Design an enzyme around this catalytic site. Sequence first.
Site, PDB file in Angstrom:
ATOM      1  N   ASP A 109       0.862  -1.178   0.000  1.00  0.00           N
ATOM      2  CA  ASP A 109       0.000   0.000   0.000  1.00  0.00           C
ATOM      3  C   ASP A 109       0.903   1.235   0.000  1.00  0.00           C
ATOM      4  O   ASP A 109       1.855   1.265  -0.799  1.00  0.00           O
ATOM      5  CB  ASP A 109      -0.961  -0.126   1.166  1.00  0.00           C
ATOM      6  CG  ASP A 109      -2.032   0.921   1.120  1.00  0.00           C
ATOM      7  OD1 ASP A 109      -3.062   0.678   0.462  1.00  0.00           O
ATOM      8  OD2 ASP A 109      -1.812   2.001   1.687  1.00  0.00           O
ATOM      9  N   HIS A 279      -6.531  -7.192  -0.158  1.00  0.00           N
ATOM     10  CA  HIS A 279      -5.471  -6.197  -0.223  1.00  0.00           C
ATOM     11  C   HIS A 279      -4.391  -6.439   0.819  1.00  0.00           C
ATOM     12  O   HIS A 279      -3.237  -6.053   0.618  1.00  0.00           O
ATOM     13  CB  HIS A 279      -6.093  -4.816  -0.020  1.00  0.00           C
ATOM     14  CG  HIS A 279      -5.111  -3.694  -0.020  1.00  0.00           C
ATOM     15  ND1 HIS A 279      -4.182  -3.520  -1.021  1.00  0.00           N
ATOM     16  CD2 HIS A 279      -4.937  -2.667   0.843  1.00  0.00           C
ATOM     17  CE1 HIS A 279      -3.469  -2.439  -0.765  1.00  0.00           C
ATOM     18  NE2 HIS A 279      -3.911  -1.903   0.358  1.00  0.00           N
TER      19      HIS A 279
END
EC number: 3.8.1.3
Lengths: 300, 298
Positions: A109, A279
Amino acid sequence: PDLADLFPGFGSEWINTSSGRIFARVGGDGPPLLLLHGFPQTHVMWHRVAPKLAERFKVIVADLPGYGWSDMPESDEQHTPYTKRAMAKQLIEAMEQLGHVHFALAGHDRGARVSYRLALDSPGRLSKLAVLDILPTYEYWQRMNRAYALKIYHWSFLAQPAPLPENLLGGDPDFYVKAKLASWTRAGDLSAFDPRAVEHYRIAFADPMRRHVMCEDYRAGAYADFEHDKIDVEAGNKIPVPMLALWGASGIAQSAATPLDVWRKWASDVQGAPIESGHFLPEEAPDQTAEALVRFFSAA
Amino acid sequence: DLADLFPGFGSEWINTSSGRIFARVGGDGPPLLLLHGFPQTHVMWHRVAPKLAERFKVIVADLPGYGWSDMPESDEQHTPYTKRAMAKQLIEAMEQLGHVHFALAGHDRGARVSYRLALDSPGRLSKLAVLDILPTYEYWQRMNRAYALKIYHWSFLAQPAPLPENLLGGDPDFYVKAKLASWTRAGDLSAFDPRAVEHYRIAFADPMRRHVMCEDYRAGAYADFEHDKIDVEAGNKIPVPMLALWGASGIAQSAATPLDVWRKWASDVQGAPIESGHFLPEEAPDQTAEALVRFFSA
Protein backbone atom coordinates in the site's frame (compact mmCIF):
# COMPACT_ATOMS: atom_id res chain seq x y z
CA PRO A 1 -5.03 1.28 26.59
CA ASP A 2 -2.17 -1.23 26.34
CA LEU A 3 -1.29 -2.86 23.02
CA ALA A 4 0.48 -6.09 22.07
CA ASP A 5 4.06 -6.97 21.18
CA LEU A 6 3.48 -8.80 17.91
CA PHE A 7 7.19 -9.19 17.06
CA PRO A 8 8.63 -11.42 19.80
CA GLY A 9 12.40 -11.31 19.63
CA PHE A 10 12.44 -8.08 17.64
CA GLY A 11 13.93 -4.99 19.18
CA SER A 12 12.46 -1.50 19.07
CA GLU A 13 14.42 1.33 17.49
CA TRP A 14 13.58 5.03 17.20
CA ILE A 15 15.70 5.96 14.17
CA ASN A 16 16.66 9.64 14.18
CA THR A 17 16.41 11.47 10.87
CA SER A 18 16.40 15.11 9.83
CA SER A 19 12.59 15.11 9.54
CA GLY A 20 11.94 13.18 12.74
CA ARG A 21 12.12 9.74 14.24
CA ILE A 22 11.20 6.55 12.43
CA PHE A 23 9.92 3.81 14.65
CA ALA A 24 10.96 0.32 13.66
CA ARG A 25 10.95 -3.18 15.04
CA VAL A 26 14.26 -4.86 14.23
CA GLY A 27 14.93 -8.57 14.38
CA GLY A 28 16.86 -11.19 12.54
CA ASP A 29 20.26 -11.03 10.97
CA GLY A 30 21.67 -11.21 7.50
CA PRO A 31 21.05 -8.82 4.64
CA PRO A 32 18.97 -5.79 5.66
CA LEU A 33 15.33 -5.90 4.62
CA LEU A 34 13.06 -2.92 5.19
CA LEU A 35 9.35 -3.65 5.40
CA LEU A 36 7.00 -0.74 4.79
CA HIS A 37 3.33 -0.73 5.72
CA GLY A 38 0.57 1.29 4.17
CA PHE A 39 -2.82 2.73 4.98
CA PRO A 40 -4.51 2.54 7.39
CA GLN A 41 -1.96 0.41 9.10
CA THR A 42 1.29 0.52 10.98
CA HIS A 43 4.40 -1.65 10.99
CA VAL A 44 2.58 -4.36 12.94
CA MET A 45 0.85 -5.40 9.70
CA TRP A 46 4.02 -7.39 8.99
CA HIS A 47 3.77 -9.33 12.25
CA ARG A 48 2.83 -12.60 10.48
CA VAL A 49 5.52 -12.50 7.79
CA ALA A 50 8.41 -10.67 9.48
CA PRO A 51 9.43 -13.65 11.70
CA LYS A 52 9.74 -15.81 8.59
CA LEU A 53 11.81 -13.12 6.89
CA ALA A 54 13.84 -12.72 10.08
CA GLU A 55 15.01 -16.30 9.53
CA ARG A 56 17.18 -15.01 6.67
CA PHE A 57 17.36 -11.20 6.92
CA LYS A 58 17.84 -8.31 9.30
CA VAL A 59 14.21 -7.30 9.09
CA ILE A 60 13.45 -3.67 9.77
CA VAL A 61 9.71 -3.16 10.19
CA ALA A 62 9.28 0.60 10.13
CA ASP A 63 6.35 2.87 10.69
CA LEU A 64 6.11 5.23 7.74
CA PRO A 65 6.95 8.89 8.47
CA GLY A 66 3.90 10.32 10.20
CA TYR A 67 2.45 6.83 10.73
CA GLY A 68 2.18 4.66 13.82
CA TRP A 69 4.84 5.76 16.27
CA SER A 70 7.13 7.49 13.78
CA ASP A 71 7.36 11.21 14.27
CA MET A 72 5.04 13.40 12.25
CA PRO A 73 6.97 16.04 10.31
CA GLU A 74 5.06 19.27 9.92
CA SER A 75 3.37 19.38 6.57
CA ASP A 76 3.27 22.29 4.13
CA GLU A 77 1.01 23.47 1.33
CA GLN A 78 2.50 20.85 -1.03
CA HIS A 79 2.34 18.06 1.59
CA THR A 80 6.03 17.64 0.89
CA PRO A 81 6.99 15.45 3.91
CA TYR A 82 4.28 12.97 2.94
CA THR A 83 5.14 12.79 -0.72
CA LYS A 84 6.62 9.40 -1.42
CA ARG A 85 9.84 11.08 -2.58
CA ALA A 86 10.31 12.75 0.80
CA MET A 87 9.27 9.63 2.69
CA ALA A 88 11.76 7.59 0.69
CA LYS A 89 14.51 10.11 1.42
CA GLN A 90 13.66 10.05 5.12
CA LEU A 91 13.72 6.25 5.13
CA ILE A 92 17.03 6.27 3.26
CA GLU A 93 18.35 8.49 6.03
CA ALA A 94 16.85 6.14 8.61
CA MET A 95 18.52 3.16 6.99
CA GLU A 96 21.83 5.09 6.90
CA GLN A 97 21.61 5.59 10.66
CA LEU A 98 21.72 1.80 10.89
CA GLY A 99 24.56 1.48 8.39
CA HIS A 100 22.23 0.19 5.67
CA VAL A 101 22.90 2.03 2.43
CA HIS A 102 22.01 -0.98 0.28
CA PHE A 103 19.00 -2.94 1.44
CA ALA A 104 16.09 -5.00 0.27
CA LEU A 105 12.69 -3.35 0.45
CA ALA A 106 9.19 -4.77 0.57
CA GLY A 107 6.33 -2.32 0.71
CA HIS A 108 2.58 -2.63 0.91
CA ASP A 109 0.00 0.00 0.00
CA ARG A 110 1.49 3.46 0.84
CA GLY A 111 4.78 1.90 1.88
CA ALA A 112 4.94 0.33 -1.57
CA ARG A 113 4.45 3.75 -3.12
CA VAL A 114 7.39 4.93 -1.04
CA SER A 115 9.24 1.83 -2.17
CA TYR A 116 8.83 2.14 -5.91
CA ARG A 117 9.45 5.90 -5.62
CA LEU A 118 12.64 5.14 -3.67
CA ALA A 119 13.59 2.70 -6.44
CA LEU A 120 13.02 5.40 -9.05
CA ASP A 121 14.85 8.10 -7.11
CA SER A 122 17.73 6.17 -5.52
CA PRO A 123 17.89 2.78 -7.24
CA GLY A 124 21.42 2.13 -5.94
CA ARG A 125 19.96 1.97 -2.44
CA LEU A 126 18.02 -1.23 -3.21
CA SER A 127 19.23 -4.74 -3.79
CA LYS A 128 15.69 -5.93 -4.59
CA LEU A 129 12.23 -4.44 -4.30
CA ALA A 130 8.85 -6.04 -3.62
CA VAL A 131 5.62 -4.06 -3.89
CA LEU A 132 2.49 -5.71 -2.52
CA ASP A 133 -0.89 -4.96 -4.09
CA ILE A 134 -0.28 -1.61 -5.74
CA LEU A 135 0.19 -0.17 -9.14
CA PRO A 136 2.12 3.08 -9.48
CA THR A 137 0.14 6.09 -8.30
CA TYR A 138 0.27 7.46 -11.84
CA GLU A 139 -1.57 4.36 -13.06
CA TYR A 140 -4.39 4.62 -10.53
CA TRP A 141 -5.05 8.21 -11.57
CA GLN A 142 -4.63 7.57 -15.30
CA ARG A 143 -7.06 4.65 -14.96
CA MET A 144 -9.44 6.84 -12.97
CA ASN A 145 -12.88 6.05 -14.30
CA ARG A 146 -16.29 5.60 -12.75
CA ALA A 147 -15.41 2.08 -11.62
CA TYR A 148 -12.08 3.07 -10.09
CA ALA A 149 -13.42 6.28 -8.56
CA LEU A 150 -15.90 4.20 -6.61
CA LYS A 151 -13.45 1.45 -5.70
CA ILE A 152 -10.68 3.76 -4.52
CA TYR A 153 -12.91 6.68 -3.57
CA HIS A 154 -10.63 7.49 -0.64
CA TRP A 155 -7.90 8.51 -3.06
CA SER A 156 -10.12 11.47 -3.88
CA PHE A 157 -11.91 11.75 -0.54
CA LEU A 158 -8.81 11.93 1.67
CA ALA A 159 -7.10 14.27 -0.81
CA GLN A 160 -9.75 16.94 -0.33
CA PRO A 161 -8.37 20.14 1.21
CA ALA A 162 -8.18 20.08 4.96
CA PRO A 163 -10.03 19.86 7.14
CA LEU A 164 -12.83 18.24 5.14
CA PRO A 165 -11.52 14.64 5.31
CA GLU A 166 -10.21 15.12 8.83
CA ASN A 167 -13.54 16.43 10.07
CA LEU A 168 -15.38 13.54 8.42
CA LEU A 169 -12.93 10.90 9.59
CA GLY A 170 -13.42 12.35 13.07
CA GLY A 171 -17.12 11.59 12.64
CA ASP A 172 -16.43 7.92 13.29
CA PRO A 173 -12.70 7.08 13.22
CA ASP A 174 -13.06 3.63 14.77
CA PHE A 175 -15.71 2.69 12.22
CA TYR A 176 -13.70 4.10 9.33
CA VAL A 177 -10.45 2.29 10.03
CA LYS A 178 -12.31 -0.96 10.64
CA ALA A 179 -14.37 -0.50 7.47
CA LYS A 180 -11.21 0.07 5.42
CA LEU A 181 -9.56 -2.99 6.92
CA ALA A 182 -12.63 -5.14 6.39
CA SER A 183 -13.79 -3.88 3.00
CA TRP A 184 -10.42 -4.60 1.38
CA THR A 185 -10.09 -8.14 2.65
CA ARG A 186 -11.34 -11.14 0.73
CA ALA A 187 -13.64 -12.04 3.60
CA GLY A 188 -15.02 -8.54 3.93
CA ASP A 189 -14.78 -8.56 7.72
CA LEU A 190 -12.04 -8.33 10.34
CA SER A 191 -11.54 -12.08 10.53
CA ALA A 192 -8.25 -12.18 8.64
CA PHE A 193 -6.62 -9.81 11.14
CA ASP A 194 -5.08 -10.53 14.48
CA PRO A 195 -7.28 -8.52 16.89
CA ARG A 196 -4.10 -7.26 18.54
CA ALA A 197 -3.02 -5.91 15.15
CA VAL A 198 -6.42 -4.27 14.69
CA GLU A 199 -6.01 -2.56 18.06
CA HIS A 200 -2.73 -1.12 16.83
CA TYR A 201 -4.44 0.23 13.71
CA ARG A 202 -7.41 1.47 15.71
CA ILE A 203 -5.30 3.38 18.23
CA ALA A 204 -3.14 5.03 15.56
CA PHE A 205 -6.24 5.98 13.66
CA ALA A 206 -7.81 7.32 16.87
CA ASP A 207 -5.33 10.23 16.90
CA PRO A 208 -6.44 13.24 14.79
CA MET A 209 -2.81 14.20 14.15
CA ARG A 210 -2.31 10.71 12.73
CA ARG A 211 -5.41 10.91 10.57
CA HIS A 212 -4.24 14.31 9.36
CA VAL A 213 -0.94 12.80 8.24
CA MET A 214 -2.75 10.06 6.34
CA CYS A 215 -4.76 12.72 4.52
CA GLU A 216 -1.51 14.55 3.85
CA ASP A 217 -0.27 11.29 2.39
CA TYR A 218 -3.25 10.97 0.06
CA ARG A 219 -3.06 14.67 -0.80
CA ALA A 220 0.54 14.08 -1.80
CA GLY A 221 -0.70 11.02 -3.65
CA ALA A 222 -3.14 13.13 -5.67
CA TYR A 223 -0.70 15.94 -6.46
CA ALA A 224 3.10 15.72 -6.00
CA ASP A 225 3.32 11.93 -6.05
CA PHE A 226 1.37 11.86 -9.31
CA GLU A 227 3.54 14.61 -10.74
CA HIS A 228 6.72 12.83 -9.72
CA ASP A 229 5.37 9.63 -11.27
CA LYS A 230 4.43 11.57 -14.42
CA ILE A 231 8.00 12.81 -14.94
CA ASP A 232 9.18 9.20 -14.86
CA VAL A 233 6.50 7.95 -17.27
CA GLU A 234 7.19 10.71 -19.76
CA ALA A 235 10.98 10.34 -19.42
CA GLY A 236 10.86 6.55 -19.78
CA ASN A 237 12.56 6.06 -16.42
CA LYS A 238 12.27 2.41 -15.46
CA ILE A 239 12.97 0.80 -12.10
CA PRO A 240 16.25 -1.10 -12.66
CA VAL A 241 16.22 -2.89 -9.31
CA PRO A 242 14.98 -6.50 -9.42
CA MET A 243 11.29 -6.23 -8.62
CA LEU A 244 8.58 -8.52 -7.31
CA ALA A 245 4.96 -7.40 -7.70
CA LEU A 246 2.56 -9.29 -5.47
CA TRP A 247 -1.14 -8.59 -5.55
CA GLY A 248 -4.28 -10.04 -4.08
CA ALA A 249 -6.69 -11.79 -6.39
CA SER A 250 -9.34 -9.66 -4.62
CA GLY A 251 -7.02 -6.73 -3.85
CA ILE A 252 -6.44 -3.10 -4.81
CA ALA A 253 -4.26 -3.76 -7.83
CA GLN A 254 -6.09 -6.32 -9.96
CA SER A 255 -9.10 -4.53 -11.50
CA ALA A 256 -7.73 -2.36 -14.29
CA ALA A 257 -4.30 -3.96 -14.25
CA THR A 258 -2.78 -7.21 -15.02
CA PRO A 259 -0.41 -5.76 -12.42
CA LEU A 260 2.64 -7.48 -13.87
CA ASP A 261 1.87 -6.06 -17.31
CA VAL A 262 1.48 -2.63 -15.73
CA TRP A 263 4.64 -3.02 -13.68
CA ARG A 264 6.68 -4.16 -16.68
CA LYS A 265 6.11 -0.68 -18.10
CA TRP A 266 7.65 0.68 -14.90
CA ALA A 267 10.48 -1.77 -14.23
CA SER A 268 12.93 -3.64 -16.42
CA ASP A 269 13.07 -6.75 -14.24
CA VAL A 270 9.82 -7.55 -12.46
CA GLN A 271 8.30 -10.88 -11.49
CA GLY A 272 4.73 -11.12 -10.35
CA ALA A 273 2.51 -13.47 -8.45
CA PRO A 274 -1.16 -13.32 -7.49
CA ILE A 275 -1.79 -14.18 -3.85
CA GLU A 276 -5.07 -15.70 -2.72
CA SER A 277 -5.87 -12.63 -0.65
CA GLY A 278 -7.60 -9.31 -0.54
CA HIS A 279 -5.47 -6.20 -0.22
CA PHE A 280 -3.82 -7.13 3.06
CA LEU A 281 -1.50 -9.77 1.71
CA PRO A 282 0.77 -10.17 4.78
CA GLU A 283 -2.18 -10.69 7.10
CA GLU A 284 -4.72 -12.37 4.83
CA ALA A 285 -2.15 -14.76 3.33
CA PRO A 286 1.01 -14.62 5.45
CA ASP A 287 2.52 -17.99 4.55
CA GLN A 288 1.97 -17.44 0.82
CA THR A 289 3.24 -13.86 1.00
CA ALA A 290 6.22 -14.80 3.17
CA GLU A 291 7.14 -17.67 0.84
CA ALA A 292 7.03 -15.40 -2.21
CA LEU A 293 9.14 -12.71 -0.50
CA VAL A 294 11.62 -15.22 0.95
CA ARG A 295 12.02 -16.86 -2.45
CA PHE A 296 12.47 -13.51 -4.19
CA PHE A 297 14.78 -11.91 -1.63
CA SER A 298 16.96 -14.92 -0.71
CA ALA A 299 20.33 -14.23 -2.36
CA ALA A 300 22.33 -11.07 -1.61
CA ASP B 1 -38.13 27.93 13.93
CA LEU B 2 -37.78 27.78 10.13
CA ALA B 3 -38.50 30.93 8.12
CA ASP B 4 -41.16 31.15 5.42
CA LEU B 5 -39.11 32.13 2.38
CA PHE B 6 -42.09 32.08 -0.04
CA PRO B 7 -44.48 34.71 1.34
CA GLY B 8 -47.97 34.19 -0.02
CA PHE B 9 -47.08 30.80 -1.47
CA GLY B 10 -49.35 27.96 -0.50
CA SER B 11 -48.26 24.74 1.18
CA GLU B 12 -49.22 21.41 -0.34
CA TRP B 13 -48.44 17.91 0.84
CA ILE B 14 -48.98 15.94 -2.36
CA ASN B 15 -49.80 12.27 -1.82
CA THR B 16 -48.10 9.87 -4.21
CA SER B 17 -47.78 6.11 -4.27
CA SER B 18 -44.20 6.61 -3.06
CA GLY B 19 -45.00 9.05 -0.26
CA ARG B 20 -45.89 12.69 0.09
CA ILE B 21 -44.16 15.43 -1.85
CA PHE B 22 -43.97 18.72 -0.06
CA ALA B 23 -44.33 21.78 -2.20
CA ARG B 24 -44.79 25.51 -2.04
CA VAL B 25 -47.28 26.62 -4.66
CA GLY B 26 -47.82 30.17 -5.79
CA GLY B 27 -48.56 32.25 -8.79
CA ASP B 28 -50.90 31.49 -11.62
CA GLY B 29 -50.47 30.54 -15.21
CA PRO B 30 -48.92 27.49 -16.80
CA PRO B 31 -47.57 24.99 -14.28
CA LEU B 32 -43.87 25.24 -13.57
CA LEU B 33 -42.30 22.61 -11.37
CA LEU B 34 -39.06 23.67 -9.67
CA LEU B 35 -36.77 20.97 -8.29
CA HIS B 36 -33.85 21.57 -5.97
CA GLY B 37 -30.82 19.44 -5.48
CA PHE B 38 -28.21 18.50 -2.94
CA PRO B 39 -27.74 19.52 -0.14
CA GLN B 40 -30.72 21.75 -0.45
CA THR B 41 -34.47 21.79 -0.25
CA HIS B 42 -37.16 23.54 -2.26
CA VAL B 43 -36.34 26.81 -0.50
CA MET B 44 -33.27 27.27 -2.74
CA TRP B 45 -35.79 28.76 -5.19
CA HIS B 46 -36.99 31.44 -2.78
CA ARG B 47 -35.17 34.21 -4.66
CA VAL B 48 -36.32 33.24 -8.15
CA ALA B 49 -39.72 31.61 -7.55
CA PRO B 50 -41.54 34.94 -6.85
CA LYS B 51 -40.50 36.31 -10.24
CA LEU B 52 -41.62 33.03 -11.79
CA ALA B 53 -44.87 33.33 -9.85
CA GLU B 54 -45.92 36.47 -11.76
CA ARG B 55 -46.06 34.36 -14.93
CA PHE B 56 -46.58 30.72 -13.93
CA LYS B 57 -48.22 28.49 -11.41
CA VAL B 58 -44.95 27.79 -9.60
CA ILE B 59 -44.70 24.46 -7.79
CA VAL B 60 -41.57 24.35 -5.61
CA ALA B 61 -41.18 20.78 -4.52
CA ASP B 62 -38.94 18.99 -2.15
CA LEU B 63 -37.50 15.99 -3.93
CA PRO B 64 -38.65 12.54 -2.80
CA GLY B 65 -36.77 11.96 0.42
CA TYR B 66 -35.61 15.56 0.72
CA GLY B 67 -36.79 18.47 2.78
CA TRP B 68 -40.27 17.82 4.04
CA SER B 69 -41.09 15.21 1.44
CA ASP B 70 -41.54 11.71 2.70
CA MET B 71 -38.56 9.39 2.43
CA PRO B 72 -39.53 6.10 0.79
CA GLU B 73 -37.55 3.23 2.21
CA SER B 74 -34.71 2.50 -0.15
CA ASP B 75 -33.43 -0.93 -1.19
CA GLU B 76 -30.22 -2.49 -2.47
CA GLN B 77 -30.68 -0.84 -5.88
CA HIS B 78 -31.56 2.52 -4.24
CA THR B 79 -34.63 2.40 -6.41
CA PRO B 80 -36.84 5.24 -5.06
CA TYR B 81 -33.89 7.58 -5.15
CA THR B 82 -33.06 6.85 -8.75
CA LYS B 83 -34.03 9.80 -10.89
CA ARG B 84 -36.27 7.48 -12.87
CA ALA B 85 -38.29 6.68 -9.76
CA MET B 86 -38.13 10.27 -8.58
CA ALA B 87 -39.37 11.49 -11.94
CA LYS B 88 -42.29 9.05 -11.82
CA GLN B 89 -43.21 10.11 -8.30
CA LEU B 90 -43.10 13.76 -9.24
CA ILE B 91 -45.22 12.96 -12.31
CA GLU B 92 -47.69 11.41 -9.88
CA ALA B 93 -47.45 14.45 -7.63
CA MET B 94 -48.16 16.82 -10.52
CA GLU B 95 -51.07 14.65 -11.70
CA GLN B 96 -52.57 15.00 -8.22
CA LEU B 97 -52.67 18.75 -8.94
CA GLY B 98 -54.20 18.19 -12.36
CA HIS B 99 -50.86 18.88 -14.05
CA VAL B 100 -50.16 16.29 -16.76
CA HIS B 101 -48.18 18.71 -18.95
CA PHE B 102 -45.91 21.19 -17.25
CA ALA B 103 -42.72 23.16 -17.41
CA LEU B 104 -39.85 21.89 -15.36
CA ALA B 105 -36.75 23.56 -13.99
CA GLY B 106 -34.34 21.48 -11.99
CA HIS B 107 -31.13 22.27 -10.19
CA ASP B 108 -28.44 19.75 -9.25
CA ARG B 109 -30.15 16.45 -8.27
CA GLY B 110 -33.52 17.91 -9.26
CA ALA B 111 -32.12 18.64 -12.70
CA ARG B 112 -31.12 15.00 -12.92
CA VAL B 113 -34.69 14.04 -12.10
CA SER B 114 -35.81 16.56 -14.70
CA TYR B 115 -33.77 15.33 -17.66
CA ARG B 116 -34.55 11.74 -16.70
CA LEU B 117 -38.18 12.76 -16.53
CA ALA B 118 -37.79 14.24 -20.02
CA LEU B 119 -36.21 11.05 -21.35
CA ASP B 120 -38.73 8.69 -19.74
CA SER B 121 -41.92 10.75 -20.10
CA PRO B 122 -41.27 13.60 -22.53
CA GLY B 123 -45.01 13.95 -23.11
CA ARG B 124 -45.29 15.29 -19.54
CA LEU B 125 -43.12 18.33 -20.21
CA SER B 126 -43.71 21.49 -22.16
CA LYS B 127 -40.23 22.91 -21.62
CA LEU B 128 -37.28 21.70 -19.57
CA ALA B 129 -34.60 23.73 -17.82
CA VAL B 130 -31.62 22.13 -16.11
CA LEU B 131 -29.35 24.21 -13.89
CA ASP B 132 -25.60 23.56 -13.62
CA ILE B 133 -25.57 19.89 -14.48
CA LEU B 134 -24.52 17.55 -17.17
CA PRO B 135 -26.20 14.15 -17.46
CA THR B 136 -25.01 11.77 -14.76
CA TYR B 137 -23.50 9.51 -17.43
CA GLU B 138 -21.35 12.39 -18.61
CA TYR B 139 -19.95 13.06 -15.15
CA TRP B 140 -18.94 9.44 -14.69
CA GLN B 141 -17.55 9.28 -18.22
CA ARG B 142 -15.42 12.37 -17.56
CA MET B 143 -14.32 11.10 -14.13
CA ASN B 144 -10.56 11.49 -14.45
CA ARG B 145 -8.14 12.57 -11.72
CA ALA B 146 -9.05 16.25 -11.86
CA TYR B 147 -12.77 15.56 -11.88
CA ALA B 148 -12.60 12.78 -9.28
CA LEU B 149 -10.92 15.32 -6.99
CA LYS B 150 -13.42 18.02 -7.96
CA ILE B 151 -16.56 15.96 -7.34
CA TYR B 152 -15.14 13.46 -4.90
CA HIS B 153 -18.55 13.47 -3.22
CA TRP B 154 -20.00 11.58 -6.18
CA SER B 155 -17.81 8.63 -5.25
CA PHE B 156 -17.78 9.26 -1.52
CA LEU B 157 -21.53 9.52 -0.92
CA ALA B 158 -21.93 6.49 -3.20
CA GLN B 159 -19.92 4.30 -0.87
CA PRO B 160 -22.01 1.49 0.64
CA ALA B 161 -24.01 2.29 3.72
CA PRO B 162 -23.28 3.12 6.42
CA LEU B 163 -19.84 4.49 5.56
CA PRO B 164 -20.73 8.03 4.39
CA GLU B 165 -23.66 8.14 6.83
CA ASN B 166 -21.30 7.32 9.71
CA LEU B 167 -18.77 9.96 8.70
CA LEU B 168 -21.49 12.54 8.04
CA GLY B 169 -23.10 11.86 11.42
CA GLY B 170 -20.22 13.21 13.49
CA ASP B 171 -20.65 16.84 12.43
CA PRO B 172 -23.38 17.17 9.80
CA ASP B 173 -23.49 20.97 10.11
CA PHE B 174 -19.89 21.14 8.89
CA TYR B 175 -20.51 19.08 5.78
CA VAL B 176 -23.69 20.76 4.60
CA LYS B 177 -22.05 24.12 5.20
CA ALA B 178 -18.89 22.90 3.47
CA LYS B 179 -20.78 21.73 0.39
CA LEU B 180 -22.89 24.88 0.23
CA ALA B 181 -19.82 27.08 0.57
CA SER B 182 -17.40 25.13 -1.64
CA TRP B 183 -19.60 25.18 -4.75
CA THR B 184 -20.29 28.92 -4.70
CA ARG B 185 -18.36 31.43 -6.75
CA ALA B 186 -17.15 33.11 -3.54
CA GLY B 187 -16.41 29.90 -1.68
CA ASP B 188 -18.29 30.87 1.47
CA LEU B 189 -21.91 31.16 2.61
CA SER B 190 -22.41 34.83 1.66
CA ALA B 191 -24.48 34.02 -1.44
CA PHE B 192 -27.14 32.27 0.65
CA ASP B 193 -29.89 33.75 2.71
CA PRO B 194 -29.11 32.73 6.33
CA ARG B 195 -32.71 31.58 6.69
CA ALA B 196 -32.23 29.36 3.64
CA VAL B 197 -29.05 27.94 5.15
CA GLU B 198 -31.02 27.06 8.28
CA HIS B 199 -33.47 25.09 6.14
CA TYR B 200 -30.61 23.21 4.49
CA ARG B 201 -28.81 22.62 7.77
CA ILE B 202 -31.92 21.44 9.63
CA ALA B 203 -32.76 19.01 6.83
CA PHE B 204 -29.16 17.79 6.86
CA ALA B 205 -29.22 17.26 10.61
CA ASP B 206 -31.70 14.40 10.20
CA PRO B 207 -29.78 11.11 9.84
CA MET B 208 -32.57 9.66 7.69
CA ARG B 209 -32.43 12.68 5.40
CA ARG B 210 -28.67 12.23 5.09
CA HIS B 211 -29.16 8.56 4.29
CA VAL B 212 -31.59 9.54 1.53
CA MET B 213 -28.97 11.84 0.04
CA CYS B 214 -26.42 9.04 0.07
CA GLU B 215 -29.03 6.77 -1.56
CA ASP B 216 -29.52 9.50 -4.13
CA TYR B 217 -25.78 9.52 -4.76
CA ARG B 218 -25.69 5.71 -4.75
CA ALA B 219 -28.43 5.70 -7.36
CA GLY B 220 -26.28 8.28 -9.15
CA ALA B 221 -23.30 5.95 -9.23
CA TYR B 222 -25.29 2.94 -10.30
CA ALA B 223 -28.87 2.80 -11.63
CA ASP B 224 -28.93 6.43 -12.77
CA PHE B 225 -25.68 5.96 -14.67
CA GLU B 226 -27.01 2.72 -16.13
CA HIS B 227 -30.27 4.36 -17.22
CA ASP B 228 -28.36 7.24 -18.76
CA LYS B 229 -25.98 4.78 -20.39
CA ILE B 230 -28.89 3.01 -22.08
CA ASP B 231 -30.21 6.25 -23.52
CA VAL B 232 -26.95 7.67 -24.79
CA GLU B 233 -25.86 4.34 -26.29
CA ALA B 234 -29.28 4.04 -27.90
CA GLY B 235 -29.04 7.61 -29.16
CA ASN B 236 -32.12 8.59 -27.18
CA LYS B 237 -32.29 12.37 -27.05
CA ILE B 238 -34.54 14.65 -25.04
CA PRO B 239 -37.16 15.89 -27.53
CA VAL B 240 -38.57 18.54 -25.17
CA PRO B 241 -37.26 22.07 -25.80
CA MET B 242 -34.74 22.60 -23.09
CA LEU B 243 -32.56 25.25 -21.56
CA ALA B 244 -29.20 24.32 -20.05
CA LEU B 245 -28.00 26.99 -17.62
CA TRP B 246 -24.75 26.72 -15.77
CA GLY B 247 -22.46 28.71 -13.56
CA ALA B 248 -19.22 29.89 -15.10
CA SER B 249 -17.64 28.73 -11.83
CA GLY B 250 -20.16 25.92 -11.34
CA ILE B 251 -19.69 22.19 -11.53
CA ALA B 252 -21.04 21.39 -14.99
CA GLN B 253 -18.46 23.51 -16.80
CA SER B 254 -15.64 21.73 -14.95
CA ALA B 255 -16.18 18.50 -16.89
CA ALA B 256 -16.71 19.93 -20.39
CA THR B 257 -18.40 22.68 -22.38
CA PRO B 258 -21.97 22.18 -21.13
CA LEU B 259 -23.81 23.09 -24.34
CA ASP B 260 -21.74 20.75 -26.51
CA VAL B 261 -22.61 17.92 -24.13
CA TRP B 262 -26.33 18.69 -23.84
CA ARG B 263 -26.60 18.77 -27.64
CA LYS B 264 -25.73 15.08 -27.56
CA TRP B 265 -28.65 14.54 -25.16
CA ALA B 266 -31.24 16.94 -26.53
CA SER B 267 -32.37 17.78 -30.05
CA ASP B 268 -33.64 21.26 -29.01
CA VAL B 269 -31.34 22.70 -26.37
CA GLN B 270 -30.28 26.26 -25.80
CA GLY B 271 -27.68 27.24 -23.26
CA ALA B 272 -26.31 30.17 -21.42
CA PRO B 273 -23.69 30.54 -18.72
CA ILE B 274 -24.38 32.72 -15.75
CA GLU B 275 -21.61 34.26 -13.67
CA SER B 276 -22.25 32.16 -10.59
CA GLY B 277 -21.09 29.12 -8.77
CA HIS B 278 -23.20 26.00 -8.71
CA PHE B 279 -26.11 27.59 -6.86
CA LEU B 280 -27.48 29.68 -9.72
CA PRO B 281 -30.85 30.69 -8.18
CA GLU B 282 -29.24 31.89 -4.96
CA GLU B 283 -25.92 33.22 -6.25
CA ALA B 284 -27.45 34.76 -9.39
CA PRO B 285 -31.18 35.11 -8.67
CA ASP B 286 -32.07 37.91 -11.06
CA GLN B 287 -30.06 36.46 -13.94
CA THR B 288 -31.39 32.96 -13.33
CA ALA B 289 -34.97 34.14 -12.95
CA GLU B 290 -34.65 36.21 -16.11
CA ALA B 291 -33.26 33.30 -18.13
CA LEU B 292 -36.01 30.99 -16.89
CA VAL B 293 -38.84 33.50 -17.39
CA ARG B 294 -37.60 34.24 -20.90
CA PHE B 295 -37.21 30.59 -21.86
CA PHE B 296 -40.48 29.38 -20.34
CA SER B 297 -42.51 32.32 -21.65
CA ALA B 298 -43.91 33.04 -25.11
